[PDB]
From Swiss-Prot, chain B:
Full-sequence range covered: 6 to 50 of 968
Location(s), subcellular: Virion; Host nucleus
Top-level taxon in the UniProt lineage: Viruses
Subunit structure: Homotrimer. Interacts with the capsid vertex protein; this interaction binds the peripentonal hexons to the neighboring penton base. Interacts with the hexon-linking protein; this interaction tethers the hexons surrounding the penton to those situated in the central plate of the facet. Interacts with the hexon-interlacing protein; this interaction lashes the hexons together. Interacts with pre-protein VI; this interaction probably allows nuclear import of hexon trimers and possibly pre-capsid assembly.
Record-given protein name: Hexon protein
Provenance organism: Human adenovirus C serotype 2
Induction trigger: Expressed in the late phase of the viral replicative cycle.
UniProtKB/Swiss-Prot annotation, chain C:
Record localization: Virion; Host nucleus
Transmembrane segment boundaries: none
Modified residues (Phosphotyrosine): Y84
Organism whose genome encodes this protein: Human adenovirus C serotype 2 (HAdV-2)
GN (gene name): L3
Function as written in the Swiss-Prot or TrEMBL entry: Major capsid protein that self-associates to form 240 hexon trimers, each in the shape of a hexagon, building most of the pseudo T=25 capsid. Assembled into trimeric units with the help of the chaperone shutoff protein. Transported by pre-protein VI to the nucleus where it associates with other structural proteins to form an empty capsid. Might be involved, through its interaction with host dyneins, in the intracellular microtubule-dependent transport of incoming viral capsid to the nucleus.
Other comments on record: All late proteins expressed from the major late promoter are produced by alternative splicing and alternative polyadenylation of the same gene giving rise to non-overlapping ORFs. A leader sequence is present in the N-terminus of all these mRNAs and is recognized by the viral shutoff protein to provide expression although conventional translation via ribosome scanning from the cap has been shut off in the host cell.
Family classification: Belongs to the adenoviridae hexon protein family.
Portion of the full sequence shown: 873 to 963 of 968
Induction annotation: Expressed in the late phase of the viral replicative cycle.
Identification of the protein by name: Hexon protein
Subunit structure: Homotrimer. Interacts with the capsid vertex protein; this interaction binds the peripentonal hexons to the neighboring penton base. Interacts with the hexon-linking protein; this interaction tethers the hexons surrounding the penton to those situated in the central plate of the facet. Interacts with the hexon-interlacing protein; this interaction lashes the hexons together. Interacts with pre-protein VI; this interaction probably allows nuclear import of hexon trimers and possibly pre-capsid assembly.
Amino acid sequence: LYATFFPMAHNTASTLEAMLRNDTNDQSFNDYLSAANMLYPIPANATN
Amino acid sequence: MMPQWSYMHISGQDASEYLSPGLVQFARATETYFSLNNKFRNPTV
Amino acid sequence: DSITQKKFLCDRTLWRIPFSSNFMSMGALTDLGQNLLYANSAHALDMTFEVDPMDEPTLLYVLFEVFDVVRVHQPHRGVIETVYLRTPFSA
Amino acid sequence: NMTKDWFLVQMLANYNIGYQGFYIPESYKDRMYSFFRNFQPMSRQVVD
């Protein structure tokens, strides 16, 4: 597993950390496709 | 459904409004060399 | 003497039917998605698809578009708490 | 055969890309004499 870290100044990283540990500053994301996926069978030669 | 919507940022304010003023300040300041934009969602209603 | 045949092809895309009063994109959270009619009470849904027949088993792939979100909380060193929410169609 | 170090340095030096993921740079910034536009990795097999 590889991971690259921005060589951020330690006093700066510390400040950012403190701010980000606040629930108010919680990060949040959404899945791009954003959907419930469903598959329904269509027997051969079926039309409806 | 307002409660869950706001908390999950599906509705309500945008990051520049709900993030602490300090973070927003820091964000703008370092935007050029270290971005935080994609980490906070901004609802569109 | 000839006969004309017309058809179309539309690969690599998905047919879309937005739940918007005018079918337009005016925001992620659609206007109909905010209608009290779909908030204060539940409803059943029926869909019927008519398709060209194919001499082999196939599948109807329906994407129900919703919000699939997560809020992450890191209160202390080595701690990660997540709140997941998917609506409609909640887990 | 290019190293992780070197790839990182060239992506940063040319596009500031590297500390927050690797991805194809905007074409307006990936000009004719830029690194990515000209980077061509290759492989082949020969009898042992």
